[PDB]
Design a protein around this ligand. Sequence first.
Ligand SMILES: NC(=O)c1ccc[n+]([C@@H]2O[C@H](COP(=O)([O-])OP(=O)(O)OC[C@H]3O[C@@H](n4cnc5c(N)ncnc54)[C@H](O)[C@@H]3O)[C@@H](O)[C@H]2O)c1
Ligand SMILES: NC(=O)c1ccc[n+]([C@@H]2O[C@H](COP(=O)([O-])OP(=O)(O)OC[C@H]3O[C@@H](n4cnc5c(N)ncnc54)[C@H](O)[C@@H]3O)[C@@H](O)[C@H]2O)c1
Ligand SMILES: O=c1ccn([C@@H]2O[C@H](COP(=O)(O)OP(=O)(O)O[C@H]3O[C@H](CO)[C@@H](O)[C@H](O)[C@H]3O)[C@@H](O)[C@H]2O)c(=O)[nH]1
Ligand SMILES: O=c1ccn([C@@H]2O[C@H](COP(=O)(O)OP(=O)(O)O[C@H]3O[C@H](CO)[C@H](O)[C@H](O)[C@H]3O)[C@@H](O)[C@H]2O)c(=O)[nH]1
Lengths: 311, 310
Amino acid sequence: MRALVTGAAGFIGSTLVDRLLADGHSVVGLDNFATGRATNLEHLADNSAHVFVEADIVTADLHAILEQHRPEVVFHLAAQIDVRRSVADPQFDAAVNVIGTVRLAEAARQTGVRKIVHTSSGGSIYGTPPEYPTPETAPTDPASPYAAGKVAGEIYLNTFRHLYGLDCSHIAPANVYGPRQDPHGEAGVVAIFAQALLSGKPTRVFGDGTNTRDYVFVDDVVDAFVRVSADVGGGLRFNIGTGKETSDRQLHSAVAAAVGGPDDPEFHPPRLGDLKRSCLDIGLAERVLGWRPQIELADGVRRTVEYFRHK
Amino acid sequence: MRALVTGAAGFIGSTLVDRLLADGHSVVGLDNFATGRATNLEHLADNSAHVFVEADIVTADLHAILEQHRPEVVFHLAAQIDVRRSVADPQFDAAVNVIGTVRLAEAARQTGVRKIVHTSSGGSIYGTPPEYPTPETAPTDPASPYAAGKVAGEIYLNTFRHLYGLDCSHIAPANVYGPRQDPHGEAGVVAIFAQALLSGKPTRVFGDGTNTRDYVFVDDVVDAFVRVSADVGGGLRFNIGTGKETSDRQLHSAVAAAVGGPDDPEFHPPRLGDLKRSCLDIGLAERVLGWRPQIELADGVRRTVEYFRH
Ligand SMILES: NC(=O)c1ccc[n+]([C@@H]2O[C@H](COP(=O)([O-])OP(=O)(O)OC[C@H]3O[C@@H](n4cnc5c(N)ncnc54)[C@H](O)[C@@H]3O)[C@@H](O)[C@H]2O)c1
Ligand SMILES: NC(=O)c1ccc[n+]([C@@H]2O[C@H](COP(=O)([O-])OP(=O)(O)OC[C@H]3O[C@@H](n4cnc5c(N)ncnc54)[C@H](O)[C@@H]3O)[C@@H](O)[C@H]2O)c1
Ligand SMILES: O=c1ccn([C@@H]2O[C@H](COP(=O)(O)OP(=O)(O)O[C@H]3O[C@H](CO)[C@@H](O)[C@H](O)[C@H]3O)[C@@H](O)[C@H]2O)c(=O)[nH]1
Ligand SMILES: O=c1ccn([C@@H]2O[C@H](COP(=O)(O)OP(=O)(O)O[C@H]3O[C@H](CO)[C@H](O)[C@H](O)[C@H]3O)[C@@H](O)[C@H]2O)c(=O)[nH]1
């Protein structure tokens, strides 16, 4: 297939580019380096099956770009990803995550694209549901601008599906970790902990440290993107996670053991916008896509911590 | 109360301003005249309780405006309102209806505003629903960018409620009609029919004329806004309509009968983005708010026709 990946210079995006190329596809990458890194794509410099376009999804001529490259599937990973930043500047977050998605959809419906695979946020969109693990049937109840924008993006794509028959599916990951996650980023606890503990710098945990997330390895998430890119799951969201809960304190201990030093984090006040509990029911992904996560947290952290020691 | 009305120079907005003033409130009206008209507010030139601010919700310093006027309730009616326009330019529609709403909420949460009363689209947000009349419990399923942006606005305000305790309710009207509706465009069928038939100018229906809408009179809609402005229905949507379906053809006949003379509309191709049926269950608004529509279509059509005559 001809594929285009927005957010291609990022953590998940660059990993997806690699997989798509390995699968024999031609891949156009698109990014504006808001949070992405040149080093994530530097290995592809001489791969003729890959072309890179520097573009801001908010302002670029996406019509022209998509007309030029004629992708069959657009994998949409470009976003403002920081929940705290979304609270600090909700307009900016909405511009990238809602307006950017709308512009992409409008471009795609005119340029013969078959399908857009959106990236939602399984970890945040449900707020505090009564069910854990949380199924896709649970109503959305976003508690941060970031989460709201992700839901809004799903809804807009569903709208374009009705209007033009432009197919869409929403990959809604839990908390994704692994090689290439920015260690210096404001988000990405697994990367943050590793970077700090390996440097021997202070680590922090928020609240009492009982807040919980569902940790899924990047390779598993990438596989879900591939599976959903076919003619399937139209207008549907798929939770992509493990369905297992790990508290902030538990995670710190799991990374501290992997480093092999002290397990003594500081305790800081709760962060406005952050949920207390997150865990995804992944049954739908199994039934419909035949997708299951292969990597358990212990194995995953092991692959991750050893990536960071080489850097 | 100190009220602020976005979209105050518009059809529903100007009507709401009048009601709030009649109820003894102070009102700040805000508009950029995208589709509104100064003539809708010109009768207030010497009204000592309304002040007008010309501002674009997408680009203006809303923080500064709210800081100066310190409204307790913001009635948010400023929006791109045309469904076909939203299809032609979804980015622009999303900028006004989503980004504009987000900017307003971000300003409001910093400036001591108690509550934002949002205007959603009861008529369109459910798309093709499971049942008619449609209750608020039906899932949203927008099939035009306009409808999608209205849903997104609701969700964003709900988020600000969680974050900051900035209260919100979503007034979700069906098809609103009455005096001051602009008759010169492609939206606002009652006004379009009324002015054209009075002038002896051509009229049209789309497709086979069987599309239905739920036609609710502007004065009734305004009443719902006032009721929901209190500490009631936080985070909730209220369908505001009649729960009765009228076809395009039937409506044309009603307006033609009121005007007198021919009932012979042209037939044009169907419009992409337009739903085939719309009808709202209004039970929630009755129980919670004590709201009921008073004006039946026949009466409403007469009042509308008379506005356009004079
Ligand atoms: N990492 C997680 O735990 C997680 C979980 C669920 C959802 N997601 C979603 O996955 C996607 C990828 O996130 P990630 O973890 O790889 O983060 P990342 O920051 O590494 O990747 C995001 C990429 O988007 C690019 N981008 C941002 N704004 C852009 C714009 N206006 N125009 C063009 N490119 C732009 C950035 O430069 C970056 O390369 C995002 O949509 C994110 O919301 C991430
Ligand atoms: N008329 C209906 O059938 C109906 C029913 C459901 C929802 N609504 C909603 O009711 C509200 C009022 O619509 P209406 O029927 O009075 O139409 P209208 O066009 O008369 O009113 C909308 C007003 O918003 C103003 N506006 C638009 N963009 C703006 C911007 N960027 N900054 C500031 N002001 C801006 C316009 O100038 C206008 O005065 C809208 O939110 C609309 O979506 C209308
Ligand atoms: O010249 C015309 C114009 C319209 N119609 C018909 O009238 C109906 C209503 O159309 P229109 O007046 O354009 O309104 P809608 O597109 O239904 O949307 C209106 O009502 C919505 C709520 O249902 C609001 O959200 C929108 O802001 C408002 O524009 C449709 O069935 C049209 O086919 C005609 O027959 N002839
Ligand atoms: O130094 C830190 C940083 C984080 N955490 C905890 O680790 C968990 C995860 O926090 P992250 O900032 O890593 O991620 P979020 O849960 O905030 O996830 C959000 O940010 C991600 C970006 O990596 C994705 O965009 C995702 O969709 C979005 O919900 C939280 O419970 C947080 O309290 C710590 O204990 N210490």
